[PDB]
Design a binder for this molecule. Structure first.
Ligand SMILES: N#Cc1cc2c(Oc3ccc(F)cc3OCCn3ccc(=O)[nH]c3=O)cc(F)cn2c1
Ligand SMILES: [Mg+2]
Lengths: 405, 544
């Protein structure tokens, strides 16, 4: 049967405008939705349904076949208390500690569970037409739709019933679920890990992304080690230390600023004194320690900031309170994006969101160093994930860019 | 009697917590009552309305002008339907067809039945003679004229009826609008008339009437302010009102008409009139015209002198968009497939900002054109931009934000977009180092700005009516004025550093403009930042 699902007290269904799509994506959606209609997964609806949720098409890795993706963010926040409080899925802290975690897609199983009849009207979407020449096609879902946060919540029971034997056979294999994605963490070799992933896939078959969190640590703040220091070197060092003093309290820069005294030329070499060298060493020792009292509150929002460093380099920080970072990292992957900033940014946002899913079990809110118009125009052309994080746009250059490079 | 095919109704409900309309009936004359009775008798004879007994249904007002039923209080309480159509099809996106037939269905809403469970809410009363007998009660059995949900239900029914005929006739193309249908084909004209007759026979199988045989409109069609010709399209003539007392509403209507004309007329400028529309005080407010605005309207009438037409879209040819800078933060563009045969044209105005440069505005215009083209043709055009490959490479590789332009090529039509200055990444060896500083007193508005250098060069200038940020900008400007072609500048102003790292070439603040003009004349400029009040050597806050 179906589980009855309702909305929050006093909120109406999602009425979000469909954004324009290219002709190839419209054709792919037409074909996919015709096939899904032939299989009862969706059904056409009339004008009595005023709800709409955007939809587009993507391409996964190593696959030229299109995939349908619904931007269920608005509908997810319209039913935020269902998938979190009432039927929430716990998050194991042992997944990030495992060596190799592989991500799989389990969305094909969601289509086997029928959806509550009273809630289908809220999953309405519109395949658009070019130049508005014809009324766009409108569908509603009859089964659990991919990308909805209530779908894994509802399917959790069936998922446990399916995974119980494999879990009891290999207890050291950690299993987690988020949206249509299934994360499987293990401490095995890549070969035997692939064989175990094949075994788990064949196990899922009869019932109806290789990550390595072991190679990731919170990056510390490193100060240069030079034999001769110019005025510009000491000025940059003092700026970086004054910045880090907002994170580490015991930082002092007075003996280093004492060297800059006077109006020397920027390129002039200034020798370090004993007090300045001791101050630099004490600052190094202070920076070697972790940050004092940094906790994770599951009720607060996760915030991810990203800085473009040039030459394909990107730095990022995930935190909840300013200057109290929960994670920091860099990104420099040469996978066909040397001449496109937006594609690099999209792949970096995807990687950071996946890491956040693994470490805390929920996506962060991004602050992208890009104009709203450029991002909103182009981000759908490089997206490959079934989920979508929230984001805002910073349009003022942060001075702290080089303090993370 | 041949039985009409069955069409299914659309279930309609009311908003939650809202009852049906119960409004009084305004008094009407006796001639109006007679006309309403004459109309309603034949309407019930046709089967579009039914007579209800004097029970307790909902009452809606009715006037006579041809009758009129006002569901104003019903529209406030009827549920929300799906958006019928947000935007109209654009002529430049249409593909050339040998024949195009327009079919306007008559008695559109009255040919589709109403939800039986909702007919009791669509009831009105005709006042009788002298109010000595009870009024005449009527209810609607079909979609009423003026009801909120009539267009959506009508278009959904039309789509559902049209689907099989369009599917079985792949050699024609049908476009469905509100109350019209547009059927285009590349068939032999006799075959086209045969297929149109078959389509209207198909519509009559479900009981939908169209203009019989010919008698239907022939090109050129007047449609939504457009003139559609067999091989071209344009807009209907634009009427520019001319008065020596330009009011605010006149400028609003003129901006609307000029934006409407700019889609095919290249070179339309509407900035000088939006500048007069900046104020929204009075709707009847006479506003004079600036000389810039006068020359603008003169060249606008010079452009609207001889007519221009756009062509239709061909999928087999490439889609090209070319951009030109008009100045004063304005850009124009043309979308075409062949030289001198534009599909359409347009303009872009810069956003409301304090600082900007041409590259950002060009990127924004490219994004706008990209979105519009994806709406109209479903693809992104190849661009011709007045900017060199090397300039764009330097920009996007040194810009702190992420940015991207789709496939494009350099067209050498001035004025070209260029980078006017580039800051160094490392301090300059042999260049003088100017430690600058500025500060103002918040109470007295008195301040000072100046510099000290490594060669002993110093300057402090006092200033009246200034602020800390202004004195910091002034200090940097003084360092730029008195320095050679290569210079290092040290500042503690995060404000000035952010302004200069935004890389502007035009600003609202004239001080920033002078700083930009100084940077333009420089060979190498390295701008270093240090924390303030930290005893850093050259930073002389004591000089202020
Ligand atoms: N009034 C009005 C009206 C007519 C249409 C309209 O017509 C078409 C329908 C189908 C098609 F395949 C092409 C069409 O038009 C292409 C341009 N064209 C025009 C005239 C001519 O003779 N030949 C020619 O190619 C399409 C639309 F989106 C809105 N319309 C409003
Ligand atoms: Mg200062």
């Amino acid at each position: 049967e179906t589980v009855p699902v309702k909305l929050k007290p006093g909120m109406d269904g999602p009425k979000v405008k469909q954004w324009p799509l290219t002709e190839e994506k419209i054709k792919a959606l037409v074909e996919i939705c015709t096939e899904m209609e032939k299989e009862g997964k969706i059904s056409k609806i009339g004008p009595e349904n005023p709800y709409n949720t955007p939809v587009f098409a993507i391409k996964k890795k190593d696959s030229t076949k299109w995939r349908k993706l619904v931007d269920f963010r608005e509908l997810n926040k319209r039913t935020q208390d269902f998938w979190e409080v009432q039927l929430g899925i716990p998050h194991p802290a042992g997944l990030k500690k495992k060596k190799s975690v592989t991500v799989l897609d389990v969305g094909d199983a969601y289509f086997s569970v029928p959806l509550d009849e009273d809630f289908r009207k809220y999953t309405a979407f519109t395949i658009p037409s070019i130049n508005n020449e014809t009324p766009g096609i409108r569908y509603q879902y009859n089964v659990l739709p991919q990308g909805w946060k209530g779908s894994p919540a509802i399917f959790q029971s069936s998922m446990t019933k399916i995974l119980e034997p494999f879990k009891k056979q290999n207890p050291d294999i950690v299993i987690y679920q988020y949206m249509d994605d299934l994360y499987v963490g293990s401490d095995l070799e890549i070969g035997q890990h692939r064989t175990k992933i094949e075994e788990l896939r064949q196990h899922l078959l009869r019932w109806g992304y290789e990550l390595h969190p072991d190679k990731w640590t919170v990056q510390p703040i490193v100060l240069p080690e030079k034999d001769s220091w110019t005025v510009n070197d000491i000025q940059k060092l003092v700026g970086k230390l004054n910045w880090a003093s907002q994170i580490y309290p015991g930082i002092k820069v007075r003996q280093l600023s004492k060297l800059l005294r006077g109006t020397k030329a920027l390129t002039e070499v200034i020798p370090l004194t004993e007090e300045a060298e001791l101050e630099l060493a004490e600052n190094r020792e202070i920076l070697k320690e972790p940050v004092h009292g940094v906790y994770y509150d599951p009720s607060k929002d996760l915030i991810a900031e990203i800085q473009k460093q040039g030459q394909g380099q990107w730095t990022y920080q995930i935190y909840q309170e300013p200057f109290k970072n929960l994670k920091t990292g860099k990104y420099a992957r040469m996978r066909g994006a040397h001449t496109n900033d937006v594609k690099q940014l999209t792949e970096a946002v995807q990687k950071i969101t996946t890491e956040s899913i693994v470490i805390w079990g929920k996506t962060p809110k991004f602050k992208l160093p890009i104009q709203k118009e450029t991002w909103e125009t182009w981000w759908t052309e490089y997206w490959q994930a079934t989920w979508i994080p929230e984001w805002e746009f910073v349009n003022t250059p942060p001075l702290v860019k080089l303090w993370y490079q | 009697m041949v039985p009409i095919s069955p069409i299914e109704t659309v279930p309609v409900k009311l908003k939650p917590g809202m009852d049906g309309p119960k409004v009084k009936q305004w008094p009407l004359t006796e001639e109006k009552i007679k006309a309403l009775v004459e109309i309603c008798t034949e309407m019930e004879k046709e089967g579009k309305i039914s007579k209800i007994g004097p029970e307790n249904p909902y009452n809606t007002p009715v006037f006579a002008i041809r009758k009129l039923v006002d569901f104003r209080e019903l529209n406030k309480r009827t549920q929300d339907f799906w958006e019928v159509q947000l935007g109209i099809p654009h002529p430049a996106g249409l593909k050339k067809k040998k024949s195009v037939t327009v079919l306007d269905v008559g008695d559109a809403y009255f040919s589709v039945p109403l939800d039986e469970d909702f007919r009791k809410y669509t009831a009105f009363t005709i006042p009788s003679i002298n109010n000595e007998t009870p009024g005449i009660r009527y209810q609607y059995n079909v979609l009423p004229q003026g009801w909120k949900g009539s267009p959506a239900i009508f278009q959904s029914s039309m789509t559902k009826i049209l689907e099989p005929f369009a599917a079985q006739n792949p050699d024609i193309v049908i476009c469905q609008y509100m109350d019209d249908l547009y059927v285009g084909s590349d068939l032999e004209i006799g075959q086209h008339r045969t297929k149109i007759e078959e389509l209207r026979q198909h519509l009559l199988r479900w009981g939908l009437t169209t203009p019989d045989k010919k008698h239907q409109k022939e090109p050129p069609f007047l449609w939504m302010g457009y003139e559609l010709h067999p091989d071209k399209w344009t807009v209907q003539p634009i009427v520019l009102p001319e008065k020596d007392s330009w009011t605010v509403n006149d400028i609003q209507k003129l901006v609307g008409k000029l934006n409407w004309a700019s889609q095919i007329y290249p070179g339309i400028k509407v900035r000088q009139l939006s500048k007069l529309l900046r104020g929204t005080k009075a709707l009847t407010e006479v506003i004079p015209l600036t000389e810039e605005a006068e020359l603008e309207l003169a060249e606008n009438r010079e452009i609207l002198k001889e007519p221009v037409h756009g062509v239709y879209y061909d999928p087999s040819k490439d889609l090209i968009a070319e951009i030109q800078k008009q100045g004063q933060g304005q850009w124009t563009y043309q979308i075409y497939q062949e030289p001198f045969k534009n599909l359409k044209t347009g303009k872009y105005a810069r956003m409301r900002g304090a600082h900007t440069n041409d590259v950002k505005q060009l990127t924004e215009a490219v994004q706008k054109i990209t979105t519009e083209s994806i709406v109209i043709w479903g693809k992104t055009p190849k661009f011709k931009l007045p900017i060199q490959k090397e300039t764009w490479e330097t920009w996007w590789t040194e810009y702190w934000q992420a940015t991207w332009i789709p496939e494009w090529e350099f067209v050498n039509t001035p004025p070209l977009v260029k980078l006017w200055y580039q800051l160094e990444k490392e301090p300059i060896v042999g260049a003088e180092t100017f430690y600058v500083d500025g500060a103002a007193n918040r109470e007295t508005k008195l301040g000072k700005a100046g510099y000290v250098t490594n060669k002993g060069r110093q300057k402090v200038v006092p200033l009246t009516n200034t602020t800390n940020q202004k004195t910091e900008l002034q200090a940097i400007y003084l360092a730029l004025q008195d320095s050679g072609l290569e210079v290092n500048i040290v500042t503690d102003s995060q404000y000035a550093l952010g302004i200069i790292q935004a890389q502007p070439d035009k600003s609202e603040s004239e001080l920033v403009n002078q700083i930009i003009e100084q940077l333009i004349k420089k060979e190498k400029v390295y701008l270093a930042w240090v924390p303030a009040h930290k005893g850093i050597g050259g930073n002389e806050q004591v000089d202020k």
